[PDB]
């Protein structure tokens, strides 16, 4: 069942950090790590326990740009369930920072 797809597809300022949604209920980092090792090494990872969301960060951005693509055509599934993978708005993986100083 060939299914097309219409998307902006505006690639200008790629982001090293990648956003992930619809994560397996009670998923273990390892899982998300095994899906990132292929492309590159995971230097930073954020797993939020609430809206089934998480942000992954590979050693370099290059590893990301290539990563997404792979999924852009291939639809992965964790624990017999579909997972969401797309770019992120935040340039850097927000982890620490002074509110005022």
From Swiss-Prot:
Included stretch of the parent chain: 51 to 138 of 531
| This protein's name | Polypyrimidine tract-binding protein 2
Function statement: RNA-binding protein which binds to intronic polypyrimidine tracts and mediates negative regulation of exons splicing. May antagonize in a tissue-specific manner the ability of NOVA1 to activate exon selection. In addition to its function in pre-mRNA splicing, plays also a role in the regulation of translation.
Record field: transmembrane = none
Q: Where is this protein found? A: Nucleus
Q: In which tissues is it expressed?
A: Mainly expressed in brain although also detected in other tissues like heart and skeletal muscle. Isoform 1 and isoform 2 are specifically expressed in neuronal tissues. Isoform 3 and isoform 4 are expressed in non-neuronal tissues. Isoform 5 and isoform 6 are truncated forms expressed in non-neuronal tissues.
Domain named RRM: which ranges?
Answer: 16-90
**Taxonomically, which superkingdom?**
Eukaryota
Which species does this protein come from?
Homo sapiens (Human)
How does it associate, per the subunit comment?
A: Monomer. Interacts with NOVA1; the interaction is direct. Identified in a mRNP complex, at least composed of DHX9, DDX3X, ELAVL1, HNRNPU, IGF2BP1, ILF3, PABPC1, PCBP2, PTBP2, STAU1, STAU2, SYNCRIP and YBX1. Part of a ternary complex containing KHSRP and HNRPH1. Interacts with NOVA2; the interaction is direct.
């Amino acid at each position: 069942g060939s299914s097309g797809s219409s998307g902006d597809k505006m690639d200008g300022a790629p982001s090293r950090v990648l956003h992930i949604r619809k994560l397996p209920g009670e998923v273990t980092e390892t899982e998300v790590i095994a899906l990132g090792l292929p492309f590159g090494k995971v230097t930073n990872i954020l797993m939020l326990k609430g809206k089934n969301q998480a942000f992954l960060e590979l050693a370099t951005e290059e590893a990301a740009i290539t990563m997404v693509n792979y999924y852009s055509a291939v639809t992965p599934h964790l624990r017999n369930q579909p997972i969401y993978i797309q770019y992120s708005n935040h340039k850097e993986l927000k982890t620490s920072g002074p509110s005022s100083g």
